[PDB]
Every structure is written in structure tokens, then in C-alpha cells.
Amino acid sequence: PYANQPTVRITELTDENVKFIIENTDLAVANSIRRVFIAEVPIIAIDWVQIDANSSVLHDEFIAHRLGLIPLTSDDIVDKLQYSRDCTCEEFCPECSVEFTLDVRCNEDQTRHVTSRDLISNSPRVIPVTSRQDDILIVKLRKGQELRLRAYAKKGFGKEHAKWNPTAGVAFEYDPDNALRHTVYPKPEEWPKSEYSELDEDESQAPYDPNGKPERFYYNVESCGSLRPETIVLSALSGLKKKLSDLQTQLSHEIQSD
Amino acid sequence: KAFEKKFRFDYTNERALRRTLQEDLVKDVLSNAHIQNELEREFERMREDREVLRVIFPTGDSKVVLPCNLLRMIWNAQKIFHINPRLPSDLHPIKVV
Amino acid sequence: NELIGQTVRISQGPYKGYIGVVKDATESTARVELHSTCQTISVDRQRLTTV
Amino acid sequence: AGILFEDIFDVKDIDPEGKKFDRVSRLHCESESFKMDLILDVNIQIYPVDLGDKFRLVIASTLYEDGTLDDGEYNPTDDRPSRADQFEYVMYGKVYRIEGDETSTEAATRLSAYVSYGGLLMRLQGDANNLHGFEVDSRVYLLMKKLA
Amino acid sequence: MNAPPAFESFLLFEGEKKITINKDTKVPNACLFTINKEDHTLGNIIKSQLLKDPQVLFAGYKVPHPLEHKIIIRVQTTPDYSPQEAFTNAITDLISELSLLEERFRVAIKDKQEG
Amino acid sequence: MIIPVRCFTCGKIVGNKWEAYLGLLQAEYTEGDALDALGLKRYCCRRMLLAHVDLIEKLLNYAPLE
Amino acid sequence: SNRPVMGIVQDTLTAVRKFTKRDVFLERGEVMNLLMFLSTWDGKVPQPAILKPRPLWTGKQIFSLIIPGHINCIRTHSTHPDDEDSGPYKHISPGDTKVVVENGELIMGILCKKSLGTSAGSLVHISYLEMGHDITRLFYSNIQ
Numbered sequence: 001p002y003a004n005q006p007t008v009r010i011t012e013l014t015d016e017n018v019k020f021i022i023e024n025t026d027l028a029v030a031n032s033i034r035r036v037f038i039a040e041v042p043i044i045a046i047d048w049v050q051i052d053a054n055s056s057v058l059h060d061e062f063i064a065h066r067l068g069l070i071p072l073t074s075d076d077i078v079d080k081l082q083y084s085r086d087c088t089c090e091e092f093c094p095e096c097s098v099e100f101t102l103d104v105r106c107n108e109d110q111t112r113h114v115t116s117r118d119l120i121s122n123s124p125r126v127i128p129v130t131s132r133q134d135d136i137l138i139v140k141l142r143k144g145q146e147l148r149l150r151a152y153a154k155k156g157f158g159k160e161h162a163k164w165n166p167t168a169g170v171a172f173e174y175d176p177d178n179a180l181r182h183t184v185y186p187k188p189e190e191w192p193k194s195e196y197s198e199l200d201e202d203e204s205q206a207p208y209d210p211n212g213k214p215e216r217f218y219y220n221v222e223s224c225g226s227l228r229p230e231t232i233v234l235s236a237l238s239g240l241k242k243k244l245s246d247l248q249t250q251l252s253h254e255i256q257s258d
Numbered sequence: 259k260a261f262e263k264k265f266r267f268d269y270t271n272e273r274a275l276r277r278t279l280q281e282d283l284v285k286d287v288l289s290n291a292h293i294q295n296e297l298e299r300e301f302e303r304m305r306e307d308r309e310v311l312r313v314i315f316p317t318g319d320s321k322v323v324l325p326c327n328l329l330r331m332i333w334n335a336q337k338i339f340h341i342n343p344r345l346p347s348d349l350h351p352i353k354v355v
Numbered sequence: 356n357e358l359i360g361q362t363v364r365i366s367q368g369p370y371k372g373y374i375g376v377v378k379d380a381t382e383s384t385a386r387v388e389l390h391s392t393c394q395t396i397s398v399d400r401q402r403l404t405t406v
Numbered sequence: 407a408g409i410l411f412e413d414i415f416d417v418k419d420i421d422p423e424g425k426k427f428d429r430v431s432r433l434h435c436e437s438e439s440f441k442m443d444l445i446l447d448v449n450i451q452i453y454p455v456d457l458g459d460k461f462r463l464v465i466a467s468t469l470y471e472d473g474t475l476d477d478g479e480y481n482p483t484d485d486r487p488s489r490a491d492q493f494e495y496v497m498y499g500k501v502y503r504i505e506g507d508e509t510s511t512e513a514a515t516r517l518s519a520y521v522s523y524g525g526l527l528m529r530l531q532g533d534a535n536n537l538h539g540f541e542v543d544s545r546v547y548l549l550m551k552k553l554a
Numbered sequence: 555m556n557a558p559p560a561f562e563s564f565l566l567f568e569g570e571k572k573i574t575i576n577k578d579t580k581v582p583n584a585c586l587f588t589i590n591k592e593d594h595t596l597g598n599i600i601k602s603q604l605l606k607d608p609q610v611l612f613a614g615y616k617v618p619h620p621l622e623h624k625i626i627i628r629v630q631t632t633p634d635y636s637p638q639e640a641f642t643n644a645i646t647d648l649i650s651e652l653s654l655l656e657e658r659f660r661v662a663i664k665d666k667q668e669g
Numbered sequence: 670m671i672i673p674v675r676c677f678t679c680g681k682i683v684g685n686k687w688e689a690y691l692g693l694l695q696a697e698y699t700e701g702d703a704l705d706a707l708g709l710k711r712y713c714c715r716r717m718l719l720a721h722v723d724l725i726e727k728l729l730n731y732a733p734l735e
Numbered sequence: 736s737n738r739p740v741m742g743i744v745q746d747t748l749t750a751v752r753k754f755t756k757r758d759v760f761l762e763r764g765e766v767m768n769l770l771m772f773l774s775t776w777d778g779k780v781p782q783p784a785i786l787k788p789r790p791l792w793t794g795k796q797i798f799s800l801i802i803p804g805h806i807n808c809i810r811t812h813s814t815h816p817d818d819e820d821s822g823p824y825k826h827i828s829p830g831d832t833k834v835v836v837e838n839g840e841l842i843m844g845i846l847c848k849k850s851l852g853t854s855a856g857s858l859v860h861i862s863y864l865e866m867g868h869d870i871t872r873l874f875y876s877n878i879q
């Protein structure tokens with residue numbers, strides 16, 4: 001029983017931002033939570049594109065790449081969605097993927113902006129984030145140019161591809177006054193103070209703490225739009241707990257095997 | 259003078275020898291004239307070698323390229339066998355020669 | 356072989372959903388040249404369905 | 407009980423020729439009981455030492471009052487009562503040199519012991535009568551405590 | 555051409571084992587846990603939580619190659635305590651700490667949303 | 670050729686901001702004021718709109734083969 | 736040229752100069768992490784150079800664990816003063832510039848290209864000539 005007893009203080013919560021503070025935990029725990037923010041939080045993003053027609057100036061793999069990076073609202077759906085690899089379906093089904101379609105032809109003499117508003121899903125929950133600011137521009141079409149495609153968006157996390165990363169910016173820091181001397185400033189007076197610095201203006205560093213350890217960690221998790229910023233953190237804690245649970249199950253099997 | 263002081267064995271100074279060597283080695287270094295004769299022959303051989311070195315290296319450059327690093331392996335022998343340099347040694351000079 | 360040259364879809368395993376063309380096929384495994392990447396994978400034919 | 411040296415030192419100088427390292431400072435200290443000269447590299451960050459400070463310095467072959475020699479291995483779970491409990495700054499090192507004013511004529515009257523605590527060097531020099539416990543390539547412990 | 559698939563960093567293939575324990579004979583009460591398809595994310599927390607245990611004499615982790623996906627955790631404990639028990643206790647404490655953190659995060663989020 | 674959907678460094682959406690950036694620059698905004706008005710605060714995102722060359726406008730001058 | 740063809744280079748050289756400075760202290764977790772990458776480690780953590788107030792190991796202890804066998808070597812750092820060898824502090828270096836490896840242990844001194852490089856009489860050269868090619872290969876890999 002050597003577990004930490006960490007506390008949470010939410011200092012800011014908007015639709016694209018959670019600034020919170022985790023106290024009384026370890027630096028490894030804080031960094032693993034920060035890494036799971038980027039790499040191990042599953043969202044829904046386009047991963048299968050067939051293109052029936054592409055008369056645009058951008059080639060087909062270009063359009064597929066731009067479709068994969070469009071975020072889709074994965075709230076309360078990616079939890080009840082299976083992985084395609086773990087699904088028993090032959091090709092695709094609502095249990096593991098969301099179907100998107102696009103059919104835009106430009107018949108007018110001005111440029112047609114094929115945006116993420118033109119992405120039509122059969123699931124009313126999983127839609128492009130800008131369709132729920134302008135829309136994410138996929139391609140521009142001249143007159144006589146057409147883009148007709150069918151896509152499937154599956155579930156995955158940022159460890160596989162960056163299009164499944166739910167976060168824009170995970171600001172993470174600790175010990176804002178350099179009390180632990182984890183970084184050593186050659187000229188401490190040359191360095192600007194952070195947002196969380198508790199020093200007056202004449203000071204440049206805290207006095208050195210010989211017995212101190214990293215015990216308070218400041219996060220600013222910014223969401224790209226797929227999940228709410230608090231949903232990213234909750235799913236990250238759940239995913240890290242699930243990874244440790246599966247590792248403990250395999251460890252119990254390995255121990256009882258010997 | 260420096261070569262004579264550094265490289266010639268001094269079997270005459272007995273009280274300086276009692277701390278350099280153990281007592282039973284000092285007894286047959288002082289008494290046995292054969293040991294003293296062979297040590298003097300060793301010093302004469304080294305003086306002849308010194309003159310040969312003077313002929314070979316006339317610019318006085320002592321940096322040579324030789325197979326076995328003798329000083330390093332003497333240091334290795336000191337460290338392996340825990341040689342205390344503050345104590346008299348149990349190695350007789352005739353054993354060295 | 357009757358599978359070589361036929362377009363094919365991986366239906367099981369970690370390549371599920373990928374479309375390819377069978378360059379070389381045996382009774383057990385088939386070399387599927389993938390349309391989506393720059394590689395030719397080797398996958399067993401029980402994970403393959405013909406489009 | 408394994409003690410090789412025991413004295414009270416007072417600091418005459420801190421980094422005389424300038425500070426060469428940020429966290430390590432070189433103290434020059436003198437003594438009262440045996441008239442000793444001490445040069446000691448101290449981790450000045452975790453153990454700050456001011457000029458003119460007085461401290462008890464103990465150099466021991468082991469950290470136990472039993473006198474039993476240790477293995478030089480880290481043992482945080484050791485529960486026997488250590489000698490380090492009575493001191494603030496405890497280092498572990500290997501004495502690497504014994505120098506002296508000995509000649510082929512006269513024995514050593516002054517002795518200098520050079521110890522390396524993981525690269526933090528110490529020279530303890532003085533009368534030879536108090537430096538008999540130092541033998542080259544033996545592991546010693548330095549234990550200093552500040553005196554109010 | 556020689557690009558590894560993106561799932562190879564986290565998916566065990568057929569016949570691959572998630573965790574393997576090998577007792578190294580260099581020192582007593584030491585074990586090496588080879589965990590496949592894992593990275594620094596689990597290695598760091600397991601190493602730190604083992605370092606919080608006073609009965610653990612050594613706790614370390616390493617990735618032998620960043621191009622491979624394999625974690626080696628070397629755990630040496632006191633003779634009255636096994637490295638496998640230390641590993642199980644570390645994972646149990648990590649899971650309990652993360653569950654407490656998740657519940658307190660939900661409580662604080664509800665406090666921030668309500669007012 | 671066309672504005673990236675994601676910022677390369679962090680992954681913020683910058684693909685819905687190019688036309689708004691051009692409209693703000695047409696409204697006699699300075700480029701820094703335009704980037705501040707679009708919520709691009711990190712300098713990794715600001716270089717995505719600042720350094721972008723819209724070559725797709727030049728590609729759309731040529732008539733389509735179809 | 737009866738000298739090694741390969742020595743420690745670039746990042747490993749810069750960080751072994753930064754590592755073997757006198758004021759480099761590693762905490763317990765950092766020491767265990769560094770010992771995870773020492774393939775010739777016998778499995779016992781050495782006694783730290785400082786036990787109290789906090790148990791801290793120096794980088795010289797870790798490199799002494801890296802140094803194979805019982806290598807004996809004397810080098811000088813590239814910033815070693817010329818007048819120091821004739822001064823009173825020749826065997827206790829104020830600037831930690833005389834490198835002494837004794838019984839395979841880095842007693843004192845900051846390592847650099849003059850000690851870990853391709854020059855004759857260096858630590859890797861003496862490691863080769865005393866231990867053999869296999870032990871020296873392990874030495875190179877462990878340093879890196």
C-alpha cells in the first residue's frame with residue numbers, strides 16, 4: 001500500500017480547454033497521463049477512403065490525407081464502438097465504423113469550396129467538428145471538377161496515427177519557480193516567469209529545495225474538437241487504468257504459469 | 259650524477275636499506291660480496307646501455323615506441339598484489355637481477 | 356492460380372479493410388500488393404475475401 | 407570502533423583560488439587538537455558551509471559501532487544502528503594516496519592522506535602519529551557534523 | 555518500402571507473449587520483466603511505483619531499441635519479498651491511485667461545471 | 670498547395686482559418702492582429718497561416734481535362 | 736600509428752565531459768536508470784559517494800562501473816593548467832583536470848577526447864591492451 005493520494009483542482013474549463021492542477025502525485029504518473037493524452041485516447045477519425053471520382057487539382061491520396069485529419073465528434077460514441085480489427089464484421093458495420101459520403105460537383109463559374117460541411121455521415125452523432133468558426137476546407141473545385149467519395153471512420157488512438165490524437169496542445173509543467181533545480185539557468189534574471197510562478201518581481205528563482213520532489217503538476221489540455229477537453233482526461237485515466245489492468249491480468253497468468 | 263644516484267644500488271647504507279628491504283634481505287645484501295659484485299655488474303651493464311642509448315639517440319629524445327608498457331604493468335602488479343609502498347619489500351635484489 | 360490477379364480485401368486481422376491485388380498466391384498464404392501503401396504484404400487466404 | 411581519525415576543524419578558507427564547480431566547494435580547514443590541515447570538496451548545495459564554521463570530522467573504516475567491515479554495496483534496508491545517525495554530512499570514498507616527508511635517511515614525520523569520495527577529493531595532512539589508520543586503496547567514510 | 559505498420563507498436567502478433575518473467579542469476583531476489591508492445595508510458599510509472607516500495611532494492615526500466623516495442627523492467631527486492639509480488643503490488647497501487655484520480659477529477663469537473 | 674488541416678507541430682485545426690485570415694487581412698488587420706483574432710496563440714500555429722502559400726488558386730486557373 | 740582508430744565521439748564525448756565533472760550528483764532513480772543500460776553490470780548498486788543528507792552518487796562512480804576490469808591510467812583534461820603539476824595541489828586537483836583511473840575506477844579527473852578519444856595511451860587504448868577486443872567493445876557500447 002504505497003499508492004499516492006492525488007488531488008485535482010480545475011482552474012479553467014471551456015469547450016476547448018481544461019487547465020487543471022494535480023497535486024500529491026509522482027512525476028512519472030503525471031508524464032504518463034500526459035503521454036496518454038496524446039497517444040492512447042481513442043477517438044473516431046476517417047481511415048478508409050474510396051474515391052469514385054476526383055477531377056480536382058489535388059490527387060487522390062492528397063484528398064484522403066486531408067479527409068483523415070478532419071476531426072469528428074467522438075463523444076459518447078467511441079466508448080461504445082469496436083475496433084475494426086476486433087470486430088466480427090466482414091468489412092464494416094455500425095459497431096466499428098461510421099460511414100461518410102461526399103459528392104460535390106462545381107457547375108458555377110466561381111470557385112467551389114468543398115469543406116467539411118459537405119461530409120455527410122449516416123450517424124447523426126459522429127459529424128465533423130466544424131459542422132456542429134468556418135468549416136475545414138478539403139479542396140477547391142473549378143467548374144467541371146468533381147469530387148465523389150465514400151469514407152469509413154474507425155476508432156483508434158494517437159500511438160497509431162496523429163489523426164487520432166484528440167489534443168491540440170498539452171501544456172504540462174511542474175515546479176514553476178525552479179525550486180528543485182531540475183533545470184539550471186546560467187543567468188536566472190534573463191528568464192521570464194511562468195503563469196503559475198509564485199515569486200515576486202525582484203526574485204528570479206525560488207530558494208533551492210534539497211528535500212523537494214515534483215509534487216504539483218499544471219496541465220492545459222486543449223482539444224482539437226473530437227472530444228470535450230474533460231472527456232480527453234477522463235478517457236486518458238480510464239485507458240491508463242485499463243492498460244495496467246490488462247498488464248496485471250497477463251502478469252497473473254505468467255506468475256501462475258511458473 | 260643523477261643516473262648514478264637513481265640507478266646504482268646502494269648496498270653500503272645499511273640503515274637506509276633496513277626500510278627499503280626486509281631484515282633478512284639486508285643481512286645477505288650487506289654480507290654477501292657476491293651479491294654486491296653482481297649488483298655492481300648490473301650497474302656497469304646499465305652504464306654501457308646508457309652510452310649505447312647516447313649513440314642511438316644523440317638528440318636526447320627519450321620517447322620510444324616499444325612493445326610492453328613496463329611502467330603500466332608495474333602499476334598493475336602493485337594494484338593486483340596490494341603493494342604497500344610504505345613498508346619494506348620482501349623481494350631480494352638478486353631475484354630482480 | 357485462380358486468385359492471382361484478382362482484386363481482394365483483407366477481412367480479418369490487423370490489415371482488415373485494406374484493398375489489394377494478389378501478385379502471388381499459394382494454398383495457404385497469398386502476397387497481396389496493397390493499394391493504400393507502398394508494400395506487398397503476405398496474408399493467409401482465410402483472412403481474404405474477393406471483391 | 408573502526409574510527410581512523412577524529413577531530414574538530416574550523417574553516418579558514420572557502421574556494422581560495424575561485425569557485426570551479428557550482429555544487430562542489432573546496433574548504434580549507436585547520437584544527438586544534440592535532441594541528442591538522444584539511445582540504446575537502448563538499449557538496450555545498452545539499453550541505454551549505456559558511457566561512458569560519460566549526461565541525462566535527464570523523465574518518466572511519468566502517469559505519470558500525472561493531473567495527474565489522476562492510477562490502478561497499480548500497481544497503482538502504484540495513485537496520486543495524488549506524489554511526490551516520492549522529493552526523494549530518496556522510497561521504498564514502500577510497501583513500502588513494504599516502505604522501506610524507508620521509509627520506510631514505512629519516513622516517514615520515516608529516517603525513518598526507520588523499521581520499522576520493524567519488525571524485526570529491528580530500529587531503530588530510532599533519533603529524534604522522536595520527537595518520538596510521540590510513541592505508542592505500544582502503545575504503546573510508548567521512549562523517550562531519552556542524553558545531554553550534 | 556521497409557515501413558513497419560503503425561499497429562506494430564501496440565499489437566501483439568500471434569504467438570507473442572505480453573509479459574515474460576526471467577529470474578537473472580547475477581544477484582538474489584532479482585527478476586527481469588520483458589513486456590512486449592509497451593513503451594515508456596507504463597515503464598516509467600511501474601519503475602516509480604516500485605521505487606516507492608521500501609522493500610525494493612532496485613527498480614529500473616529500459617527500451618533496448620526505440621525501433622522495437624519492448625520494455626525490460628529489472629526489479630530486485632529484499633530476500634523476504636519477491637519481485638513478482640513487488641510488481642503486482644506496484645500495478646495494484648497504480649490502478650488504485652488512477653481510480654482515485656479519475657473519481658476526484660469527475661468530482662472537480664462537476665464542481666467547475668455547476669459553479 | 671492548400672492550407673493544411675492540422676498544424677504540423679501540435680495538431681490544432683488551421684484548415685478552417687485560411688479564408689477567415691484572408692478576410693481579416695482584407696479588413697486592414699495586421700497579420701499579428703489577424704492571427705490573434707483567430708485564436709492562433711502558439712507560434713507553431715501562427716506560422717501555419719503566416720507562411721502558407723495558396724498555390725491551389727494558381728492551379729485552378731488551368732482548365733480541367735474533363 | 737599504434738593508437739585506436741575509434742574513440743568516444745560527438746554527444747557521448749560532450750556528455751562524458753559534462754558527466755565526470757566534480758559537481759555531478761545522481762539520485763537513486765537516475766542511478767538505477769543508468770545502470771539499466773550497463774550491460775557488464777554485476778547487479779549490485781555501489782555505495783554512494785554521499786550517504787547523508789541525501790544518498791547521491793557521482794558520475795565518476797557510474798563511469799567506474801563502466802570502466803572494465805582493473806584499468807590503470809593517468810591522463811589530463813584539455814583545460815589542465817601547466818603550473819599545477821609543479822604546485823602544491825598536483826595530486827588534489829582544484830579544477831579536477833588530472834584523470835586517474837586506478838583498479839578500473841575513475842578516482843578523479845574529467846574525461847574528454849584526451850582520455851576517451853583515439854589518442855595513444857588513452858582509456859580505450861589501455862582498455863584494449865589490457866582486456867581484449869571483446870571487453871573493449873563492451874566498454875564502447877556501455878559508455879555510449
Ligand SMILES: [Zn+2]
Pocket residue numbers: 082084087088089091092093094095096097
Ligand atoms: Zn464491424
Ligand SMILES: [Zn+2]
Pocket residue numbers: 676677678679680681711713714715
Ligand atoms: Zn500548432
